[PDB]
Amino acid sequence: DEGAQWNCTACTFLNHPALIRCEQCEMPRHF
Amino acid sequence: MQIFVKTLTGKTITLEVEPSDTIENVKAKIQDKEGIPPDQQRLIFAGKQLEDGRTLSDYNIQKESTLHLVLR
Amino acid sequence: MQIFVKTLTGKTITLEVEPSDTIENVKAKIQDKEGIPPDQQRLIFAGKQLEDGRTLSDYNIQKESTLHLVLRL
Ligand SMILES: [Zn+2]
């Protein structure tokens, strides 16, 4: 129960839920 | 057809493309407008990084799609 | 080749690897350098958690790729 992949708000890149910043663009996850 | 390339700083860029255009064609077009070397451009669409092999139709990229430009 | 391994803080680790090394091999290298046991390491590349048995080229991880390291208890 970790969470779905999330799409970066800045670039749409679909991230692993365990990353707090976007793997592609490094923007912190948007909430 | 037109597509848009949005950079990480907000700048939206309009490109003239064909569905049969390769990702490298698209990058060279961005170089022509913004002067960024293709080797530094990453293109993101629908959550995926686009690969130099494919065409826009491969990625099902349609008129007025927005791509995201990530510099690296 | 060399690859990088980045933790959540941004601390980057430099590994020398063959594209043929497994993810287990790579975790052991992280363990020697960092002291984190392999079972507590999660490696992540292109939004996907890596498999212990798989290799680096199985994931098309190539020279200068950056993997992300995340803990687990
Ligand atoms: Zn991003």
Curated annotation (Swiss-Prot), chain A:
<feature type="region of interest" description="Interaction with polyubiquitin">
    <location>
        <begin position="13"/>
        <end position="23"/>
    </location>
</feature>
<comment type="function">
    <text>Adapter required to activate the JNK and NF-kappa-B signaling pathways through the specific recognition of 'Lys-63'-linked polyubiquitin chains by its RanBP2-type zinc finger (NZF). Acts as an adapter linking MAP3K7/TAK1 and TRAF6 to 'Lys-63'-linked polyubiquitin chains.</text>
</comment>
<protein>
    <recommendedName>
        <fullName>TGF-beta-activated kinase 1 and MAP3K7-binding protein 2</fullName>
    </recommendedName>
</protein>
<feature type="zinc finger region" description="RanBP2-type">
    <location>
        <begin position="1"/>
        <end position="31"/>
    </location>
</feature>
<comment type="subunit">
    <text>Interacts with MAP3K7 and TRAF6. Identified in the TRIKA2 complex composed of MAP3K7, TAB1 and TAB2. Binds 'Lys-63'-linked polyubiquitin chains. Interacts with NCOR1 and HDAC3 to form a ternary complex. Interacts (via C-terminal) with NUMBL (via PTB domain). Interacts (via the C-terminus) with DYNC2I2 (via WD domains). Interacts with RBCK1. Interacts with TRIM5. Interacts with TRIM38 (via B30.2/SPRY domain), leading to its translocation to lysosomes and degradation. Interacts with ASB1; this interaction promotes TAB2 stability.</text>
</comment>
<feature type="modified residue" description="(Microbial infection) S-methylcysteine">
    <location>
        <position position="11"/>
    </location>
</feature>
Curated annotation (Swiss-Prot), chain C:
<feature type="cross-link" description="Glycyl lysine isopeptide (Lys-Gly) (interchain with G-Cter in ubiquitin)">
    <location>
        <position position="11"/>
    </location>
</feature>
<feature type="cross-link" description="Glycyl lysine isopeptide (Lys-Gly) (interchain with G-Cter in ubiquitin)">
    <location>
        <position position="6"/>
    </location>
</feature>
<feature type="cross-link" description="Glycyl lysine isopeptide (Lys-Gly) (interchain with G-Cter in ubiquitin)">
    <location>
        <position position="29"/>
    </location>
</feature>
<feature type="cross-link" description="Glycyl lysine isopeptide (Lys-Gly) (interchain with G-Cter in ubiquitin)">
    <location>
        <position position="63"/>
    </location>
</feature>
<feature type="site" description="Interacts with activating enzyme">
    <location>
        <position position="54"/>
    </location>
</feature>
<feature type="modified residue" description="Phosphoserine; by PINK1">
    <location>
        <position position="65"/>
    </location>
</feature>
<feature type="cross-link" description="Glycyl lysine isopeptide (Lys-Gly) (interchain with G-Cter in ubiquitin)">
    <location>
        <position position="33"/>
    </location>
</feature>
<feature type="cross-link" description="Glycyl lysine isopeptide (Lys-Gly) (interchain with G-Cter in ubiquitin)">
    <location>
        <position position="27"/>
    </location>
</feature>
<protein>
    <recommendedName>
        <fullName>Ubiquitin</fullName>
    </recommendedName>
</protein>
<feature type="site" description="Essential for function">
    <location>
        <position position="68"/>
    </location>
</feature>
<feature type="domain" description="Ubiquitin-like">
    <location>
        <begin position="1"/>
        <end position="73"/>
    </location>
</feature>
<feature type="cross-link" description="Glycyl lysine isopeptide (Lys-Gly) (interchain with G-Cter in ubiquitin)">
    <location>
        <position position="48"/>
    </location>
</feature>
<feature type="site" description="Interacts with activating enzyme">
    <location>
        <position position="72"/>
    </location>
</feature>
<comment type="function">
    <text>Exists either covalently attached to another protein, or free (unanchored). When covalently bound, it is conjugated to target proteins via an isopeptide bond either as a monomer (monoubiquitin), a polymer linked via different Lys residues of the ubiquitin (polyubiquitin chains) or a linear polymer linked via the initiator Met of the ubiquitin (linear polyubiquitin chains).</text>
</comment>
